């Protein structure tokens, strides 16, 4: 499924999420969402029926969340609030199978249905999308700034002082994809974010050999082709 | 109503059998003898896919290698000659009661041999110096396992909460890690002192690796 991009928000704002379905999936199937922090797992917070008539969340969540759907049928919504750092993840939209089962039933002298209550179970979750990564911070967009890493050697390029994530970092232009290793960002006091890529290369080759690492920070425009040479 | 995985990470070497568990509180199992607990893998980066269903049943492109099994509050996912790409975090869903609630999950990791770490060190550039602040960065490379502990020391003074590491994902291909630390400093600080040391720590090591650099 097709969700929406990453979005930046401050803390206690509002965030609406959106997903769209391939012809109507949307009601062969139930649509859920999923999220997952940074330390954290998978953690359900809510789902909607396609049939329409339950919309429920997980506890954590009761009096932020709002599931609503465009009455096309075709896209979904979103809609969380109270807005914590917590509240920083991957947030998946997917399709369910339940099960909607009677349990109890009580009929009356005239053979008519007098109580009866229905209950929806979850079978599994499938088809997902490629979830909308929420930031909920104080800083700004930054570009980052690229610094030398130099010293069989090792040399690399240091992505520095940028918000939002992510950032991607090839190397040569994609010549380079063997003895490179781009690591997790961490998170900085600053609020803003610091990441590290390197390649080991033989030293041999250092005179003779190039080797660029391309920096690309699509939240705010910055791209740097760096050159590394000790 | 509360799911537990058990263990919470997984040492398999390939071509082997990987067991696990979840254990509900509650009985999962709806009164028409169907088992609400699906199992699921995420792998890093990645949407997450559903394995099994209701228990045992298997969805669309699943090998039989997983087999989802148990009954009532005791379940269990088995992968059967795993591969390098199996390495992941597999998830059981219960299904049953209100609210639906995932697992804490079980990392699955490639078991390998011991393979000890390559050191570097990097001085802070010119460039970054003439912003007042300096970074100098330690690299860990492709060891096994992923137990390691890095010591920036600073003229001989141990550095401690100055300092900010990370690991990456297992290596697809050689099974293993490597690892990024970065102390920071001021610029006037750093030119209050001259030796720069990373003092590497892993049972691939007889003795602690230190990887030094001095200012000029």
């Known amino acids: 499924l097709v969700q929406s991009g990453a979005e930046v928000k401050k803390p206690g704002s509002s965030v609406k999420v959106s997903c769209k379905a391939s012809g109507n999936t949307f009601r062969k199937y139930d649509v859920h969402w999923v999220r997952q922090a940074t330390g954290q797992g998978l953690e359900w917070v809510g789902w909607?029926?396609?049939?329409?008539?339950?919309?429920e969340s997980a506890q954590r969540f009761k009096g932020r969340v709002s599931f609503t759907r465009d009455n096309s049928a075709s896209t979904a919504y979103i809609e969380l609030r109270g807005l914590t750092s917590d509240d920083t993840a991957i947030y998946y939209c997917?399709?369910?199978?339940?099960?909607?089962?009677?349990?109890?039933?009580?009929?009356?002298?005239?053979?008519?249905?007098?109580?009866?209550?229905?209950?929806?179970?979850?079978?599994?979750?499938?088809?997902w999308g490629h979830g909308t990564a929420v930031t909920v911070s104080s800083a700004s967009t930054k570009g980052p700034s690229v610094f030398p890493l130099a010293p069989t050697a090792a040399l690399g390029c240091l992505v520095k002082d940028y918000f939002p994530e992510p950032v991607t970092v090839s190397w040569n232009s994609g010549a380079l994809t063997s003895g490179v290793h781009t690591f997790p960002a961490v998170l900085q006091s600053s609020g803003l974010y610091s990441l590290s890529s390197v390649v080991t290369v033989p030293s041999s080759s250092l005179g003779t050999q190039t080797y660029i690492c391309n920096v690309n920070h699509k939240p705010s425009n910055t791209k740097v082709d760096k050159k590394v040479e000790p | 109503t509360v799911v537990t995985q058990s263990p919470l990470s997984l040492s398999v070497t390939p071509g082997e059998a990987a067991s696990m568990s979840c254990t509900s509180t509650?009985?999962?199992?709806?009164?028409?003898?169907?088992?609400?607990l699906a199992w699921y893998q995420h792998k890093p980066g990645q949407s997450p896919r559903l394995l099994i269903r209701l228990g045992s049943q298997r969805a669309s492109g699943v090998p039989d290698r997983f087999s989802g099994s148990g009954s009532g509050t005791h379940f269990t996912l088995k992968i059967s000659r795993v591969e390098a790409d199996d390495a992941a975090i597999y998830y059981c869903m219960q299904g049953l009661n209100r609210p639906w609630t995932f697992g804490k999950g079980t990392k699955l990791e490639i078991k390998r041999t011991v393979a000890a770490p390559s050191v570097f060190i990097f001085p802070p550039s010119d460039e970054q110096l003439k912003s007042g602040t300096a970074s100098v960065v330690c690299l860990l490379n492709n060891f096994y396992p992923r137990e390691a502990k890095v010591q920036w020391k600073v003229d001989n003074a141990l550095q401690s909460g100055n300092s900010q590491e990370s690991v990456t994902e297992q290596d697809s291909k050689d099974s293993t890690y490597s690892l990024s630390s970065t102390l920071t400093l001021s610029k006037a600080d750093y030119e209050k002192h001259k030796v720069y040391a990373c003092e590497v720590t892993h049972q691939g090591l007889s003795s602690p690796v230190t990887k030094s650099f001095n200012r000029g």
């Open positions: 509650q009985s999962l199992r709806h009164s028409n003898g169907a088992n609400y």
């Open positions: 909607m029926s396609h049939e329409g008539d339950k919309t």
């Open positions: 997917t399709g369910g199978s339940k099960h909607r089962l009677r349990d109890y039933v009580l009929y009356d002298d005239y053979g008519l249905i007098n109580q009866q209550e229905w209950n929806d179970y979850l079978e599994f979750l499938d088809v």
